[PDB]
Amino acid sequence: SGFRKMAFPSGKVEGCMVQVTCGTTTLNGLWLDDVVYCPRHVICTSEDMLNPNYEDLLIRKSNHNFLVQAGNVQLRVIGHSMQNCVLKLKVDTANPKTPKYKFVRIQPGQTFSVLACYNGSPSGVYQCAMRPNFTIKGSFLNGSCGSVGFNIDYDCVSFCYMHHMVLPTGVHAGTDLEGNFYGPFVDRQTAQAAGTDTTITVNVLAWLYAAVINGDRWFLNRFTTTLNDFNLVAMKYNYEPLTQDHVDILGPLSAQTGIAVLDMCASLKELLQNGMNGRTILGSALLEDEFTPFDVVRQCSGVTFQ
Amino acid sequence: SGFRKMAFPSGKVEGCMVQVTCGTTTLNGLWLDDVVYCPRHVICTSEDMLNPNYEDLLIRKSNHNFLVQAGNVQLRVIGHSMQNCVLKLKVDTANPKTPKYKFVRIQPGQTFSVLACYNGSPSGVYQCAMRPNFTIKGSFLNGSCGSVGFNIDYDCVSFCYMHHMVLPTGVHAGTDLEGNFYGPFVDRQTAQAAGTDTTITVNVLAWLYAAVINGDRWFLNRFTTTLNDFNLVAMKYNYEPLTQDHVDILGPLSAQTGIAVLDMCASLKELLQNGMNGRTILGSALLEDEFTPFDVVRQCSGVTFQ
Numbered sequence A, B: 001s002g003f004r005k006m007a008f009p010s011g012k013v014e015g016c017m018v019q020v021t022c023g024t025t026t027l028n029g030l031w032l033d034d035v036v037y038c039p040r041h042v043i044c045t046s047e048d049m050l051n052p053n054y055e056d057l058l059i060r061k062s063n064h065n066f067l068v069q070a071g072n073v074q075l076r077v078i079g080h081s082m083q084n085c086v087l088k089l090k091v092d093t094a095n096p097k098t099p100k101y102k103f104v105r106i107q108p109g110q111t112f113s114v115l116a117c118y119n120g121s122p123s124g125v126y127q128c129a130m131r132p133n134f135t136i137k138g139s140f141l142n143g144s145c146g147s148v149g150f151n152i153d154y155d156c157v158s159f160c161y162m163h164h165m166v167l168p169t170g171v172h173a174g175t176d177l178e179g180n181f182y183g184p185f186v187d188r189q190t191a192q193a194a195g196t197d198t199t200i201t202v203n204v205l206a207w208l209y210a211a212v213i214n215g216d217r218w219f220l221n222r223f224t225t226t227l228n229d230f231n232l233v234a235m236k237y238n239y240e241p242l243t244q245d246h247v248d249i250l251g252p253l254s255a256q257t258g259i260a261v262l263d264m265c266a267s268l269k270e271l272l273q274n275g276m277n278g279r280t281i282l283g284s285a286l287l288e289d290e291f292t293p294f295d296v297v298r299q300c301s302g303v304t305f306q
């Protein structure tokens, strides 16, 4: 029983984490085959950061300027280049622990696991969601830069995120592993705020299905509603529109519980309108939106990896 | 920036997980050197579990009935003995990936990471607490038995929990790695109940301190209180009493915030009596008691491992 925010096992990724130093700046890098990936601002000092000229700072630099350490092993850089906001360092050793991997760009609402790192060493793991405003609600200190987010499919590690920065609200921003930002953010120290964040309705519904599977059923009402009427209400409350795709993704959970997605949609309509009256669902007193429908299925089926 | 329930990186433990089969009952095993630890009810069929005589059941068993899989590769069991409610299967191959490890019995209120496994394969990692009544609020499906809970100190893995059973409430119960239950439970299928569960006061205070460090300060008072006044409130709400040891344990957080423990107790007093009034704290609408003071120090100072 029970229902937790669960991260993927981190071992496959742990074996890929290294430390990259340029001058007096050190941050985390990701070592796959004979390439190390890190944030490009590794070449910046804390005063370059108001508005760097990366092309210019970079051209100055030579292979020998970049120190790569993997545990105790010093890695010899034999090449460097900049793709968007990431630096790729070609090294003389392929990482023997390199797992099957791919790089993906996740969409708003999708979850993944973060392995928070300081000085190339793993400190912690937790699950997050890409928020609709393209930020994440992570946990990161100074030196976290270059920590990575990922999903695991059996044996294939899909890397979706590398960490770059924290925004005034205390939420976070970063890139894909091709160094393109999620959202309209830039890698410089200047005024930038995320837009308004919305709640991810498809995930809330998934969460409500989890509750039902775990015996928490008090919020089921005898109404139903249409998708159009549902969405009119959800716009009112800063909830994301629900699509037909969302509906069909909820199917497994719908078929499991005997509860039509439009029925659950109606339970949710009432909760937004009248609130939760101090009552909890699965121990939470707020509606949770950082579990996808696949997340609920895996934790309510036993999906494993190796 | 940010406060999340963070788990320890799981790689060291992942390499120790095997699959243990006896009859057609399969569950999780922990392979350290040339010993594999699992729950002793691996030797039980369905009929046995209402009231097994483990001694008698085990006598009918022999090494030959014990099939240990380690990924794709079968392991030869050359020995066996029952230690309390756990089974020690001597195998022929020491585990090459054995980390430095110790076995510890944790106390109520202490947190640890769980690597949830099915069929000997990692599924997920998450953080929880030993509750005052010696249950945990985990996430476990059929086949989760023998999954383990752990802490990492630098390079040392301290194994503190092995999972055995779910209780009426949907809370879980298990043993240490020498097979002695946390709490009054037994490994048999009969109606058992945990005690009343209290809130871990020292952890709530640690979380409030995390709240202040992350800039969420609205619940601060200027009032104070003694330990005695506070305690005589606390027990009204089923908060565990707060001892001087707890005060001294909270002293790092106090010194970092500049807020005396007894002041913070005063803040918690008002919160217990006045409720939150629809206010959140670190984005929660309830008081969180599953972060120790050390946890708070770790994630607000960024301690690493491996």
Ligand SMILES: *[C@@](O)(c1nc2c(F)cccc2s1)[C@H](C[C@@H]1CCNC1=O)NC(=O)[C@@H]1[C@@H]2[C@H](CN1C(=O)[C@@H](NC(=O)C(F)(F)F)C(C)(C)C)C2(C)C
Pocket: A025, A027, A039, A041, A042, A044, A045, A046, A049, A140, A141, A142, A143, A144, A145, A146, A164, A165, A166, A167, A168, A172, A186, A187, A188, A189, A190, A191, A192, B001
């Ligand atoms: C990160 O780890 C990095 N730290 C350094 C560094 F010290 C020197 C050179 C390069 C880098 S990358 C760090 C992670 C931060 C620390 C606090 N919590 C985090 O998540 N990222 C940054 O310091 C980041 C880099 C410059 C300024 N950064 C910021 O996060 C700033 N925010 C903004 O400018 C805002 F996004 F607009 F709000 C800051 C310092 C928090 C105000 C750059 C963006 C390249």
Ligand SMILES: *[C@@](O)(c1nc2c(F)cccc2s1)[C@H](C[C@@H]1CCNC1=O)NC(=O)[C@@H]1[C@@H]2[C@H](CN1C(=O)[C@@H](NC(=O)C(F)(F)F)C(C)(C)C)C2(C)C
Pocket: A001, B025, B027, B039, B041, B042, B044, B045, B049, B140, B141, B142, B143, B144, B145, B146, B164, B165, B166, B167, B168, B172, B186, B187, B188, B189, B190, B191, B192
């Ligand atoms: C666990 O994984 C094990 N499963 C088996 C099995 F199928 C055959 C033999 C041995 C074991 S151990 C499982 C974990 C449970 C399943 C559901 N959620 C979990 O956490 N543990 C049990 O099934 C466990 C074993 C017998 C009965 N168990 C219970 O958890 C039962 N509870 C109680 O008896 C009660 F707590 F008192 F209510 C049950 C089946 C959920 C009612 C034993 C303790 C030996």
